[PDB]
mmCIF file of C-alpha atoms in Angstrom:
data_model
loop_
_atom_site.group_PDB
_atom_site.id
_atom_site.type_symbol
_atom_site.label_atom_id
_atom_site.label_comp_id
_atom_site.label_asym_id
_atom_site.label_seq_id
_atom_site.Cartn_x
_atom_site.Cartn_y
_atom_site.Cartn_z
ATOM 1 C CA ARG A 4 13.991 -103.613 57.380
ATOM 2 C CA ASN A 5 11.096 -102.184 59.378
ATOM 3 C CA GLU A 6 12.982 -100.937 62.448
ATOM 4 C CA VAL A 7 13.560 -97.360 63.638
ATOM 5 C CA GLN A 8 16.113 -96.456 66.345
ATOM 6 C CA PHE A 9 15.975 -92.820 67.517
ATOM 7 C CA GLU A 10 16.893 -90.559 70.408
ATOM 8 C CA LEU A 11 14.482 -88.112 72.008
ATOM 9 C CA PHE A 12 15.404 -84.851 73.881
ATOM 10 C CA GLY A 13 13.311 -82.463 75.964
ATOM 11 C CA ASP A 14 14.028 -79.773 78.537
ATOM 12 C CA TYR A 15 10.725 -80.764 80.160
ATOM 13 C CA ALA A 16 8.195 -83.588 79.852
ATOM 14 C CA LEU A 17 4.764 -84.291 81.318
ATOM 15 C CA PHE A 18 3.499 -87.923 80.929
ATOM 16 C CA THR A 19 0.478 -87.514 83.143
ATOM 17 C CA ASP A 20 -0.017 -90.092 85.867
ATOM 18 C CA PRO A 21 -3.862 -90.288 85.807
ATOM 19 C CA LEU A 22 -4.156 -90.921 89.580
ATOM 20 C CA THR A 23 -2.796 -87.402 90.159
ATOM 21 C CA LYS A 24 -5.448 -85.515 88.236
ATOM 22 C CA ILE A 25 -7.180 -83.784 91.213
ATOM 23 C CA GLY A 26 -7.512 -80.147 91.878
ATOM 24 C CA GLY A 27 -6.430 -78.855 88.494
ATOM 25 C CA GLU A 28 -3.063 -80.583 89.067
ATOM 26 C CA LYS A 29 -0.945 -83.108 87.267
ATOM 27 C CA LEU A 30 2.215 -84.982 88.144
ATOM 28 C CA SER A 31 4.331 -86.676 85.443
ATOM 29 C CA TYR A 32 5.085 -90.386 85.498
ATOM 30 C CA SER A 33 8.785 -91.057 86.036
ATOM 31 C CA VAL A 34 9.213 -92.220 82.373
ATOM 32 C CA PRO A 35 7.240 -92.077 79.057
ATOM 33 C CA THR A 36 4.326 -94.424 78.484
ATOM 34 C CA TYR A 37 4.202 -96.830 75.559
ATOM 35 C CA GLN A 38 1.415 -94.775 74.020
ATOM 36 C CA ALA A 39 3.381 -91.465 74.407
ATOM 37 C CA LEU A 40 6.332 -92.982 72.506
ATOM 38 C CA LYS A 41 4.019 -94.397 69.831
ATOM 39 C CA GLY A 42 2.645 -90.772 69.344
ATOM 40 C CA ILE A 43 6.158 -89.471 68.967
ATOM 41 C CA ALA A 44 7.172 -92.129 66.344
ATOM 42 C CA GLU A 45 4.016 -91.170 64.499
ATOM 43 C CA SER A 46 5.271 -87.534 64.500
ATOM 44 C CA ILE A 47 8.314 -88.642 62.560
ATOM 45 C CA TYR A 48 6.312 -90.332 59.759
ATOM 46 C CA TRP A 49 2.962 -92.111 59.611
ATOM 47 C CA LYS A 50 0.371 -93.513 57.213
ATOM 48 C CA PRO A 51 -2.686 -95.560 58.119
ATOM 49 C CA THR A 52 -1.142 -98.459 56.096
ATOM 50 C CA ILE A 53 1.177 -99.114 59.026
ATOM 51 C CA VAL A 54 1.137 -99.299 62.826
ATOM 52 C CA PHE A 55 4.100 -98.580 65.151
ATOM 53 C CA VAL A 56 5.091 -100.976 67.952
ATOM 54 C CA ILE A 57 7.533 -99.732 70.569
ATOM 55 C CA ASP A 58 9.983 -102.420 71.580
ATOM 56 C CA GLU A 59 12.344 -100.799 74.046
ATOM 57 C CA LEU A 60 13.132 -97.519 75.861
ATOM 58 C CA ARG A 61 16.432 -96.484 77.430
ATOM 59 C CA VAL A 62 16.374 -93.632 80.018
ATOM 60 C CA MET A 63 19.731 -91.739 79.539
ATOM 61 C CA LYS A 64 19.389 -88.961 82.188
ATOM 62 C CA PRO A 65 18.597 -89.173 85.971
ATOM 63 C CA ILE A 66 14.830 -88.884 86.640
ATOM 64 C CA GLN A 67 14.084 -85.481 88.201
ATOM 65 C CA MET A 68 10.974 -83.483 88.795
ATOM 66 C CA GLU A 69 10.183 -79.777 88.958
ATOM 67 C CA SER A 70 6.907 -78.070 90.025
ATOM 68 C CA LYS A 71 5.696 -75.063 87.981
ATOM 69 C CA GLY A 72 2.687 -72.754 88.294
ATOM 70 C CA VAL A 73 0.573 -72.933 85.154
ATOM 71 C CA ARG A 74 -2.790 -72.041 83.662
ATOM 72 C CA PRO A 75 -4.412 -75.210 82.198
ATOM 73 C CA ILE A 76 -6.087 -74.616 78.833
ATOM 74 C CA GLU A 77 -9.682 -75.891 78.807
ATOM 75 C CA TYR A 78 -13.228 -74.742 77.947
ATOM 76 C CA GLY A 79 -14.952 -72.696 80.693
ATOM 77 C CA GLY A 80 -11.736 -72.505 82.795
ATOM 78 C CA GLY A 81 -10.402 -69.464 84.610
ATOM 79 C CA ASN A 82 -9.747 -71.241 87.928
ATOM 80 C CA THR A 83 -5.995 -71.508 87.981
ATOM 81 C CA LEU A 84 -3.137 -71.104 88.759
ATOM 82 C CA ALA A 85 -2.520 -74.795 89.239
ATOM 83 C CA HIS A 86 0.738 -76.531 89.928
ATOM 84 C CA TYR A 87 2.006 -79.181 87.578
ATOM 85 C CA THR A 88 5.080 -81.345 88.236
ATOM 86 C CA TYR A 89 7.195 -81.894 85.145
ATOM 87 C CA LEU A 90 10.095 -84.252 84.359
ATOM 88 C CA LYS A 91 13.169 -82.057 83.811
ATOM 89 C CA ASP A 92 16.082 -82.495 81.368
ATOM 90 C CA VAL A 93 15.200 -85.859 79.692
ATOM 91 C CA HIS A 94 16.926 -87.873 76.981
ATOM 92 C CA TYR A 95 15.787 -91.252 75.764
ATOM 93 C CA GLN A 96 16.859 -93.847 73.179
ATOM 94 C CA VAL A 97 13.890 -95.658 71.581
ATOM 95 C CA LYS A 98 13.731 -98.927 69.570
ATOM 96 C CA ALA A 99 10.537 -99.420 67.610
ATOM 97 C CA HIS A 100 9.328 -100.973 64.333
ATOM 98 C CA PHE A 101 6.246 -100.832 62.083
ATOM 99 C CA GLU A 102 3.836 -103.609 61.033
ATOM 100 C CA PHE A 103 0.996 -103.537 58.509
ATOM 101 C CA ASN A 104 -2.352 -102.417 59.791
ATOM 102 C CA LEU A 105 -4.580 -105.504 59.223
ATOM 103 C CA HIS A 106 -7.652 -103.531 60.265
ATOM 104 C CA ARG A 107 -7.316 -101.683 56.904
ATOM 105 C CA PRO A 108 -7.944 -104.327 54.192
ATOM 106 C CA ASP A 109 -8.349 -101.551 51.614
ATOM 107 C CA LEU A 110 -4.741 -100.566 52.068
ATOM 108 C CA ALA A 111 -3.240 -103.951 51.213
ATOM 109 C CA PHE A 112 -1.780 -102.480 47.898
ATOM 110 C CA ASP A 113 0.339 -100.048 49.980
ATOM 111 C CA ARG A 114 1.924 -102.653 52.276
ATOM 112 C CA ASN A 115 5.474 -102.142 51.052
ATOM 113 C CA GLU A 116 8.279 -102.246 53.603
ATOM 114 C CA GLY A 117 10.862 -100.641 51.289
ATOM 115 C CA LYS A 118 8.580 -97.598 50.670
ATOM 116 C CA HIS A 119 7.649 -97.045 54.329
ATOM 117 C CA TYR A 120 11.105 -97.793 55.738
ATOM 118 C CA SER A 121 12.966 -95.493 53.308
ATOM 119 C CA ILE A 122 10.529 -92.616 53.893
ATOM 120 C CA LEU A 123 10.588 -93.182 57.682
ATOM 121 C CA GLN A 124 14.442 -93.216 57.705
ATOM 122 C CA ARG A 125 14.641 -90.103 55.479
ATOM 123 C CA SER A 126 12.124 -88.293 57.687
ATOM 124 C CA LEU A 127 14.111 -89.296 60.816
ATOM 125 C CA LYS A 128 17.419 -87.914 59.408
ATOM 126 C CA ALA A 129 15.543 -84.609 59.055
ATOM 127 C CA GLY A 130 14.167 -84.668 62.588
ATOM 128 C CA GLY A 131 10.646 -85.761 61.580
ATOM 129 C CA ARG A 132 7.675 -84.282 59.851
ATOM 130 C CA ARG A 133 5.666 -82.935 62.765
ATOM 131 C CA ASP A 134 6.467 -81.156 66.037
ATOM 132 C CA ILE A 135 7.698 -83.394 68.829
ATOM 133 C CA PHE A 136 5.910 -82.984 72.131
ATOM 134 C CA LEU A 137 6.753 -84.930 75.337
ATOM 135 C CA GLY A 138 3.293 -85.504 76.820
ATOM 136 C CA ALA A 139 2.061 -81.897 76.493
ATOM 137 C CA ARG A 140 2.148 -78.913 74.121
ATOM 138 C CA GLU A 141 4.266 -76.848 76.539
ATOM 139 C CA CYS A 142 6.935 -79.629 76.425
ATOM 140 C CA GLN A 143 8.363 -79.412 72.900
ATOM 141 C CA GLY A 144 11.532 -81.366 72.190
ATOM 142 C CA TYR A 145 13.175 -83.152 69.159
ATOM 143 C CA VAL A 146 14.241 -86.476 67.711
ATOM 144 C CA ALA A 147 17.392 -87.699 65.962
ATOM 145 C CA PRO A 148 18.781 -90.949 64.451
ATOM 146 C CA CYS A 149 20.628 -92.925 67.124
ATOM 147 C CA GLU A 150 22.028 -96.446 67.463
ATOM 148 C CA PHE A 151 20.020 -98.018 70.314
ATOM 149 C CA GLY A 152 22.284 -98.773 73.230
ATOM 150 C CA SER A 153 25.157 -96.622 71.996
ATOM 151 C CA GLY A 154 26.865 -94.205 74.419
ATOM 152 C CA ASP A 155 26.803 -94.085 78.221
ATOM 153 C CA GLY A 156 23.635 -93.371 80.200
ATOM 154 C CA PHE A 157 22.960 -92.525 83.798
ATOM 155 C CA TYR A 158 21.280 -95.857 84.685
ATOM 156 C CA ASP A 159 24.061 -98.097 83.186
ATOM 157 C CA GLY A 160 24.568 -100.824 85.806
ATOM 158 C CA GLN A 161 21.944 -99.484 88.201
ATOM 159 C CA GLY A 162 20.061 -102.815 88.384
ATOM 160 C CA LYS A 163 16.232 -103.212 88.542
ATOM 161 C CA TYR A 164 13.946 -100.201 89.310
ATOM 162 C CA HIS A 165 10.190 -101.013 89.917
ATOM 163 C CA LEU A 166 8.528 -97.936 88.519
ATOM 164 C CA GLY A 167 5.093 -99.271 89.472
ATOM 165 C CA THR A 168 1.790 -99.679 87.636
ATOM 166 C CA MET A 169 1.645 -97.495 84.474
ATOM 167 C CA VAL A 170 -0.792 -96.871 81.680
ATOM 168 C CA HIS A 171 0.505 -98.742 78.609
ATOM 169 C CA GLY A 172 -1.996 -97.233 76.208
ATOM 170 C CA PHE A 173 -5.590 -97.430 75.001
ATOM 171 C CA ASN A 174 -7.513 -99.793 72.754
ATOM 172 C CA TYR A 175 -9.722 -97.736 70.490
ATOM 173 C CA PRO A 176 -12.977 -98.517 68.591
ATOM 174 C CA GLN A 181 -13.239 -103.235 69.260
ATOM 175 C CA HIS A 182 -16.530 -101.741 70.687
ATOM 176 C CA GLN A 183 -15.519 -99.862 73.809
ATOM 177 C CA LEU A 184 -12.563 -97.705 74.834
ATOM 178 C CA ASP A 185 -10.253 -99.934 76.903
ATOM 179 C CA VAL A 186 -7.186 -98.940 78.992
ATOM 180 C CA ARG A 187 -4.096 -101.190 79.154
ATOM 181 C CA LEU A 188 -1.895 -101.186 82.302
ATOM 182 C CA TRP A 189 1.284 -103.055 83.185
ATOM 183 C CA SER A 190 3.963 -103.152 85.836
ATOM 184 C CA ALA A 191 6.789 -101.033 84.419
ATOM 185 C CA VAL A 192 10.286 -102.175 85.306
ATOM 186 C CA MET A 193 13.593 -100.614 84.194
ATOM 187 C CA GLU A 194 16.819 -102.634 84.289
ATOM 188 C CA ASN A 195 20.132 -100.905 83.882
ATOM 189 C CA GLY A 196 18.128 -98.096 82.238
ATOM 190 C CA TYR A 197 16.232 -100.334 79.739
ATOM 191 C CA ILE A 198 12.462 -100.816 79.680
ATOM 192 C CA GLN A 199 11.163 -103.657 77.443
ATOM 193 C CA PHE A 200 7.457 -103.159 76.520
ATOM 194 C CA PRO A 201 4.948 -105.963 76.136
ATOM 195 C CA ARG A 202 2.927 -105.750 72.907
ATOM 196 C CA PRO A 203 -0.531 -104.205 73.370
ATOM 197 C CA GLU A 204 -2.252 -107.673 73.118
ATOM 198 C CA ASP A 205 -0.018 -109.066 75.907
ATOM 199 C CA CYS A 206 -0.650 -106.383 78.566
ATOM 200 C CA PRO A 207 -1.666 -108.105 81.855
ATOM 201 C CA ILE A 208 -4.541 -105.630 82.631
ATOM 202 C CA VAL A 209 -6.945 -104.466 79.922
ATOM 203 C CA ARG A 210 -10.441 -103.148 80.755
ATOM 204 C CA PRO A 211 -13.078 -100.640 79.504
ATOM 205 C CA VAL A 212 -12.352 -97.200 81.060
ATOM 206 C CA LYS A 213 -15.981 -96.917 82.293
ATOM 207 C CA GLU A 216 -14.963 -96.547 89.307
ATOM 208 C CA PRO A 217 -14.437 -95.025 92.838
ATOM 209 C CA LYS A 218 -14.732 -98.493 94.595
ATOM 210 C CA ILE A 219 -11.304 -99.769 93.389
ATOM 211 C CA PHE A 220 -9.807 -97.229 95.834
ATOM 212 C CA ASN A 221 -11.825 -98.482 98.797
ATOM 213 C CA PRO A 222 -9.729 -99.434 101.837
#
C-alpha cells in the first residue's frame, strides 16, 4: 500500500499556460498539470523520504473559463489592472502513489511504507495538512478521500479530447533547470500521465526563434 486516491474541488483554478504570459495577463490551461497535482498531493502530507508520482486524473465537471480583472502581486508592480482567465467550478478525481526518494541516501532508515501510507491516509481523511491551492493563491479549494472512478462525471463517454501540448513539470537541480512537455490527451474524462523520465520533450528552460514562422 502506497497509493492515494482523492478528489479535489475549487470554485476557481488557474494553471497558467506559459505561452499566455504577455501583458500582465494569464490564461489557465484547460486542466491541471502533472506538477500542479504533485504540489497538491504534497499539501496533504509530505516528507523528503518520499516522492509523489501522479498516475491518473479524471475531470468531473465541464471545462469553462471566466475572465476577471485583477492586480498581480509582484515586486515593483503598480501597473495593473490585468485580466486573468480562470477555470471555473472544477472537480477532479486523482490517482497517485509515493516512491522512495533515491536521491536521499541519508534517509534510507525512514523508507517505511506502512508509516508513510498510514500518515498520508490519516491526513487525507482530515482534508490534508496544508492549504490547497489550484494553481494560484487566490484559488483556494479542498481535498477529500474518494474512490478513483466512482460516481458519474461530465466527460463519461465523451471519447478522446486532444488538449494540446502542456507543461508536465520541471526537473530541478541534475545540473540545469529543465522543463518537461507532453501531448495531453483526455479519454472519457481520464488523463493518464507519463512518468517524469518518460516525457517526450525535456530541455533546459534557457528562445524567441522557436516561434519563427
